[PDB]
Amino acid sequence: RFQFDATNPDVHDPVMAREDGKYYIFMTGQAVGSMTSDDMKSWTPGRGVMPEIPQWAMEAVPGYRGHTWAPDISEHNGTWYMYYSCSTFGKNGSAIGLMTNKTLNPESPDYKWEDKGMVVRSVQRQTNWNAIDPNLIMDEKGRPWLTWGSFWDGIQLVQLDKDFKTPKGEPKTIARRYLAGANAIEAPFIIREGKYYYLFVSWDYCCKGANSNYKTAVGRSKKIEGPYVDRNGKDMAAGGGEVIAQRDDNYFGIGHSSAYQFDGQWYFMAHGYARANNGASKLVIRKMNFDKDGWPVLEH
């Protein structure tokens, strides 16, 4: 029996954007998957984003054939930038690519995704981080920075040249799980709120159905590079973090997070392994607020 369930759709590694009162979700899928909602409540599957699967990617990552992971979307000066991951599960022979578009509406005559090639690559038996899970974050000076990473040494941070694709120096590890290996940390996401940058990370194990233990943690820093810390002063680089999404009455695990502010309200978006669908990965959106001390807290 065929069913979509518009109010509770299957999604993996989601990211969200809004244009002209319409909500756009981009996720892991062929050519990057997509969804569409008028009200952020009922969704409609769309076409794969990529107009074709880029050659440079298939070459740099052997095995990659268009099944793309964890996109990131954001708008800067009327240009939409979408970062995307190319890899094969369990290995770090990976590359992050970028593509740009003037609009997100596919019925628009201005709609055309121009691929801009490779941003950053990780290579087998050599690089101590994994070139997947990108997130673009701007500083107060307007300069672009990227976070990415999954396992190995952990979460990387590097400033990007103003073309949004070439890094400046080498990266610098910014958050760890403890102390592929057992450094279960991935899906970094940084937002600016108040006096601080908040780095959101996913801890532990996704991708194991109803046996996943995925969770989401948070830490903060006044400086973008500067040490990220939890409620009691512990550095994320050493395994600090406040758990904010977790094993639940509804979920075995919740992770691969992202945060957006729509109409004065912050929203925490992730995917959760739903108990009512024996571990199927569903869309999770919770209202997020910052307390007195300036720490994020979720609804439900």
Q: What's the rounded Cα separation, in Å, for the pair 220 and 277?
A: 34
Resolution (A): 2.9
DSSP 182-220: T--EEEEEEEEETTEEEEEEEES--SSGGG---EEEEEE
Q: What's the rounded Cα separation, in Å, for the pair 235 and 271?
A: 26
Q: What's the rounded Cα separation, in Å, for the pair 135 and 258?
A: 9
Among positive and negative, which fits the CA dihedral 167, 69, 104, 199?
Answer: negative
Domains plus CATH for the chain? 1-300 (2.115.10.20)
Contact 217, 255 (CB under 8 A): no
**Ramachandran region of residue 154, left (φ > 0), alpha (ψ -120 to 50) or beta?**
left
**Ramachandran region of residue 271, left (φ > 0), alpha (ψ -120 to 50) or beta?**
beta
Amino acid at 147: T
Specify the experimental method: X-ray
- Positions annotated as catalytic residues are 13, 186
Contact 289, 266 (CB under 8 A): yes
| Matching residue, tokens 């954007």 | 17
Q: What's the rounded Cα separation, in Å, for the pair 38 and 22?
A: 5
Cα-flanking dihedrals φ and ψ of residue 57, to 5°? -80, -50
Q: What's the rounded Cα separation, in Å, for the pair 33 and 281?
A: 14
Q: What's the rounded Cα separation, in Å, for the pair 297 and 169?
A: 35
- To 5 degrees, how large is the angle CA 178–CA 209–CA 239? 10
Let me know if 195 is exposed, middle or buried by CB neighbors in 10 A (0-12, 13-18, 19+): exposed
Q: 286: which 2 tokens? A: 């919770």
Contact 104, 17 (CB under 8 A): yes
Q: What's the rounded Cα separation, in Å, for the pair 15 and 69?
A: 11
Amino acid at 167: P
DSSP the chain: -----TTS-B-SS-EEEEETTEEEEEESEETSEEEEESSSSS-EE---S-SS--HHHHHHSTT-SSEEEEEEEEEETTEEEEEEEE--TT---EEEEEEEES-S-TTSTT---EEEEEEEEE-TTT-SS-S---EEEE-TTS-EEEEE-BSTT-EEEEEB-TTSSSBSS--EEEE-S---TT--EEEEEEEEETTEEEEEEEES--SSGGG---EEEEEEESSSSSPPB-TTS-BGGGT--EEEE-S-SSEEEEEEEEEEEETTEEEEEEEEEEGGGTTEEEEEEEEEEE-TTS-EEE--
Beta bridge partners of 229: 220, 235
Beta bridge partners of 261: 266
